[PDB]
Amino acid sequence: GTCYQQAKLVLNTAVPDRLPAREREMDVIRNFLREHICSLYLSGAPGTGKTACLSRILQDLKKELKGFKTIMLNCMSLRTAQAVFPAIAQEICDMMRKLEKHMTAEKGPMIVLVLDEMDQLDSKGQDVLYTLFEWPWLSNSHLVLIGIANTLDLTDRILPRLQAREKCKPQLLNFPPYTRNQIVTILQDRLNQVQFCARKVSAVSGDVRKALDVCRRAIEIVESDVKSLIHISQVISEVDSFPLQQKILVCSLMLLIRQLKIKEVTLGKLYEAYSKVCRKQQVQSECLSLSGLLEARGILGLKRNKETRLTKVFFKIEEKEIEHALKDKALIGNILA
Amino acid sequence: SVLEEARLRLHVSAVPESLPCREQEFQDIYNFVESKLLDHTGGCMYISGVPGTGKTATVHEVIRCLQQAAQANDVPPFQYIEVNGMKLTEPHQVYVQILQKLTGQKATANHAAELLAKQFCTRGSPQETTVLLVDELDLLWTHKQDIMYNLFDWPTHKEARLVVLAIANTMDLPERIMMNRVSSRLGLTRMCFQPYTYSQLQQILRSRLKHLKAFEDDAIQLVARKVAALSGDARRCLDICRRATEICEFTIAHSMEAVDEMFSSSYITAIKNSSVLEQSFLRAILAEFRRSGLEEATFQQIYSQHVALCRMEGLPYPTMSETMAVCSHLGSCRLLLVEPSRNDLLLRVRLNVSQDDVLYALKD
Amino acid sequence: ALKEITRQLNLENVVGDKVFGSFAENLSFLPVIFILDEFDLFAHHKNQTLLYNLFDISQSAQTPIAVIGLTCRLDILELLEKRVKSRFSHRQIHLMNSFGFPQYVKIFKEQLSLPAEFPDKVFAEKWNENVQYLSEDRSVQEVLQKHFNISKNLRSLHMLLMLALNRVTASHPFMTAVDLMEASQLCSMDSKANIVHGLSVLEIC
Ligand SMILES: Nc1ncnc2c1ncn2[C@@H]1O[C@H](COP(=O)(O)OP(=O)(O)OP(O)(O)=S)[C@@H](O)[C@H]1O
Numbered sequence: 001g002t003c004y005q006q007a008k009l010v011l012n013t014a015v016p017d018r019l020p021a022r023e024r025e026m027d028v029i030r031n032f033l034r035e036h037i038c039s040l041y042l043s044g045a046p047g048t049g050k051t052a053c054l055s056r057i058l059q060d061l062k063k064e065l066k067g068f069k070t071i072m073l074n075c076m077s078l079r080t081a082q083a084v085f086p087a088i089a090q091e092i093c094d095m096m097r098k099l100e101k102h103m104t105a106e107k108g109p110m111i112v113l114v115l116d117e118m119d120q121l122d123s124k125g126q127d128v129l130y131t132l133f134e135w136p137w138l139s140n141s142h143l144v145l146i147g148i149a150n151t152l153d154l155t156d157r158i159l160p161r162l163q164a165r166e167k168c169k170p171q172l173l174n175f176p177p178y179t180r181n182q183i184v185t186i187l188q189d190r191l192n193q194v195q196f197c198a199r200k201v202s203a204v205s206g207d208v209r210k211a212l213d214v215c216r217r218a219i220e221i222v223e224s225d226v227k228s229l230i231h232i233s234q235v236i237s238e239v240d241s242f243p244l245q246q247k248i249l250v251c252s253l254m255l256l257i258r259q260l261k262i263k264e265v266t267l268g269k270l271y272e273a274y275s276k277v278c279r280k281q282q283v284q285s286e287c288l289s290l291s292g293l294l295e296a297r298g299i300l301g302l303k304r305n306k307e308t309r310l311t312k313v314f315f316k317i318e319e320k321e322i323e324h325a326l327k328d329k330a331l332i333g334n335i336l337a
Numbered sequence: 338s339v340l341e342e343a344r345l346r347l348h349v350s351a352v353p354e355s356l357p358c359r360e361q362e363f364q365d366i367y368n369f370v371e372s373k374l375l376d377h378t379g380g381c382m383y384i385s386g387v388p389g390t391g392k393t394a395t396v397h398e399v400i401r402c403l404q405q406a407a408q409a410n411d412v413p414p415f416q417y418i419e420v421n422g423m424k425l426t427e428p429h430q431v432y433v434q435i436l437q438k439l440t441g442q443k444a445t446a447n448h449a450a451e452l453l454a455k456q457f458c459t460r461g462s463p464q465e466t467t468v469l470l471v472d473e474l475d476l477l478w479t480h481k482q483d484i485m486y487n488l489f490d491w492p493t494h495k496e497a498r499l500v501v502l503a504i505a506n507t508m509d510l511p512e513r514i515m516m517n518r519v520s521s522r523l524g525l526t527r528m529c530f531q532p533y534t535y536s537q538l539q540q541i542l543r544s545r546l547k548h549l550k551a552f553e554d555d556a557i558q559l560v561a562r563k564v565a566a567l568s569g570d571a572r573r574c575l576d577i578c579r580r581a582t583e584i585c586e587f588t589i590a591h592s593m594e595a596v597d598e599m600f601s602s603s604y605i606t607a608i609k610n611s612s613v614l615e616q617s618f619l620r621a622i623l624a625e626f627r628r629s630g631l632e633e634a635t636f637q638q639i640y641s642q643h644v645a646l647c648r649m650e651g652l653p654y655p656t657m658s659e660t661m662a663v664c665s666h667l668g669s670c671r672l673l674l675v676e677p678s679r680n681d682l683l684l685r686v687r688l689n690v691s692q693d694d695v696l697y698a699l700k701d
Numbered sequence: 702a703l704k705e706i707t708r709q710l711n712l713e714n715v716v717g718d719k720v721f722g723s724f725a726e727n728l729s730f731l732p733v734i735f736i737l738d739e740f741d742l743f744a745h746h747k748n749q750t751l752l753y754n755l756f757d758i759s760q761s762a763q764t765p766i767a768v769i770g771l772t773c774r775l776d777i778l779e780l781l782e783k784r785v786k787s788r789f790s791h792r793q794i795h796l797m798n799s800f801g802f803p804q805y806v807k808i809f810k811e812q813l814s815l816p817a818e819f820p821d822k823v824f825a826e827k828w829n830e831n832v833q834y835l836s837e838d839r840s841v842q843e844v845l846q847k848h849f850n851i852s853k854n855l856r857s858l859h860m861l862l863m864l865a866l867n868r869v870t871a872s873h874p875f876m877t878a879v880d881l882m883e884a885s886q887l888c889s890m891d892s893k894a895n896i897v898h899g900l901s902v903l904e905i906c
């Protein structure tokens with residue numbers, strides 16, 4: 001039992017001591033920082049561990065080098081973009097002038113400011129980002145600024161002026177998604193005491209966190225079965241009885257979309273078809289409630305236009321999958337005929 | 338009396354101690370937090386289900402079991418906080434509601450959020466594991482999605498010691514409402530509660546009325562079958578049983594009366610009990626619609642058809658004001674659709690009910 | 702609404718006087734009956750918070766609360782959200798004027814009948830005989846038939862009776878069918894024709 005618990009604990013989302021398969025990016029960041037201690041923009045997909053690797057390398061530099069002050073800040077913690085200005089000042093001690101005068105000092109330790117999730121610092125005129133990027137290139141500047149983002153167009157959409165002036169272009173580094181071999185290496189690094197899951201994770205999103213969750217859930221199911229390839233595929237397929245009136249309603253809507261060919265059907269015509277089908281088989285608030293319940297299950301989508309009749313209905317499932325979801329052909333034939 | 342006892346047992350607020358109808362789900366939940374309580378590590382789970390599936394009751398029963406286990410010094414002590422989304426005047430105010438629950442301090446929304454962030458991000462004094470329950474998640478939405486992001490991201494931190502369970506009705510919420518990083522955080526941890534089968538409903542009803550012989554098996558079976566064929570909800574089943582008891586105070590006929598009185602629409606009888614002039618107006622509208630085929634008609638053509646029908650029927654010539662008053666009275670009870678506040682002779686009229694229902698009401 | 706609820710319950714001393722938005726003072730503390738006139742307007746609020754809280758405390762096991770709503774719309778069920786609709790006990794009463802024309806005549810006869818507590822008894826008996834006689838007059842029945850065809854609502858009947866009684870003086874202690882005819886004529890004139898009649902030659906051209 002302790003083996004399963006330890007395997008679950010090791011495979012958590014907490015930042016580990018070592019992050020393999022990312023040695024190239026870590027080396028690039030280390031060389032950049034060591035050159036600028038004796039403007040960086042990291043862009044990457046979610047789950048690439050950019051925050052974890054940057055924290056690890058910053059801790060390593062703190063351990064090995066002295067004479068610099070490192071300031072972390074998360075943009076999500078700020079309700080307003082402008083609120084970045086005080087939060088920085090509170091970490092070092094009109095306010096922007098005080099920041100500049102404290103940053104342009106002739107004598108002073110280097111400052112390494114990192115703002116996680118840079119994309120949240122957007123402004124109606126992008127002024128804050130412009131000032132932040134123009135700070136390192138002022139007179140007597142001692143700033144090494146690092147910006148982490150998931151968006152790939154921050155250097156494109158937000159900063160045309162920095163492309164206009166050659167001196168103010170930062171150095172960009174992108175984090176490619178983890179490949180299957182890299183995921184396998186990380187997984188075997190976690191368990192020093194698989195390929196199929198790594199392949200699916202790489203093909204879908206390449207998110208190491210998703211693979212960790214998949215293997216954690218597989219371990220959970222295995223330990224539950226014991227206490228009482230198959231597990232991994234089972235969990236992934238799991239993530240990646242209907243009321244009779246709802247069956248009649250969805251069959252009527254399918255008949256309507258097959259008949260009149262329109263993509264979206266008004267609720268009144270749907271109710272009329274439902275009543276006709278019920279009369280055929282001898283079986284408006286109830287109809288709308290059933291439509292809402294079907295929307296809850298994710299079978300049907302509703303464009304809500306603030307009125308009962310104006311709310312439009314559409315499907316989300318292929319016809320063949322709809323037919324095969326039904327376990328009885330007698331009802332199918334009866335409704336068709 | 339036996340009927341009084343049955344009424345008392347069938348009340349909604351009379352929660353049972355434990356019904357194994359959801360035990361499986363219970364067991365699953367009974368593992369998850371338990372592990373999160375034994376490893377001193379936080380977690381997050383999203384549970385989506387249609388209303389009336391007993392999600393709140395199941396969560397409360399699990400919390401009761403965990404509290405009882407903690408009182409028996411088998412689980413390390415923990416602090417439980419429960420918040421309801423729809424019981425809050427403003428979204429951001431939840432930051433206060435949590436804070437005052439854990440420290441009792443009064444602060445503004447921004448300051449409360451800052452203090453909560455500081456407490457959950459900084460290595461403070463070792464506190465008991467925090468079990469946070471949030472109800473009606475979809476009502477905490479914001480165009481900036483900051484509150485939801487923080488709620489589902491804070492337990493990720495090791496120092497948080499936070500376990501969060503998000504109860505909601507829509508299973509699509511983490512995909513089409515939740516952004517990418519937070520979607521994967523709740524991903525692979527979605528519990529879906531299916532509606533009760535008629536067997537489950539019958540078991541629940543039998544458990545409600547154990548050792549009590551007041552209802553026949555046929556009536557209970559028919560009530561459960563009807564509920565399964567309509568919505569599969571326990572609340573309306575209990576309401577139908579209560580109404581059937583009330584009628585029996587005055588067989589399957591009682592349950593049939595309850596179900597067809599508390600579910601059926603009253604449009605037909607309201608039309609039937611309408612006045613003669615209103616009936617003539619409706620007939621004129623139907624005739625004009627048949628002549629034209631459109632679902633919108635101006636008030637002038639309707640008035641002309643009404644005048645023709647009155648002449649055919651021999652009724653006295655009606656004035657425009659009387660017709661407009663009748664139209665306003667009909668529109669007040671939402672039988673039609675009109676905006677007669679400013680326009681008088683150029684009013685678009687739409688039927689609020691199906692034409693065949695009108696025909697079946699007017700044929701008699 | 703919260704301010705009115707607090708003030709009517711005389712808990713402002715307990716809750717507090719300032720404009721503070723916290724309402725958990727009542728909510729935590731919360732047999733009291735609620736009456737809600739024009740219930741449809743509450744459904745148009747931003748989140749239906751008050752209705753949801755009332756239904757929740759009704760379904761809760763803390764204190765007994767009885768909720769009574771009044772509505773003119775027949776579609777009050779669809780104006781509610783799914784949650785409150787599920788928590789709403791489907792108890793409906795319908796008030797329709799389900800009675801025939803003779804019953805309307807009986808209602809008219811009874812409404813204009815003096816009570817038994819009036820001081821003068823012979824005058825009351827004469828008044829009752831007079832209204833009984835006026836009941837079967839065919840002009841009065843024609844007026845009642847016209848108004849009954851127009852609308853069965855008792856409010857219009859009360860208005861018509863009030864206007865008829867306005868023309869009751871000392872010289873005419875007891876009403877007349879011609880008085881009811883005059884009242885019916887006064888109640889049933891079209892404004893558009895009057896406005897057109899009040900114009901000038903150039904406007905007519
Ligand atoms: N395990 C159970 N077996 C039988 N009946 C149950 C069970 N759990 C709850 N119920 C009943 O079903 C009702 C609905 O339970 P709730 O949890 O309040 O509904 P819900 O699923 O939370 O949906 P809402 O919209 O939040 S009320 C309860 O009030 C009980 O009367």
Ligand SMILES: [Mg+2]
Nearest residue numbers: 392393394472
């Ligand atoms: Mg609930």
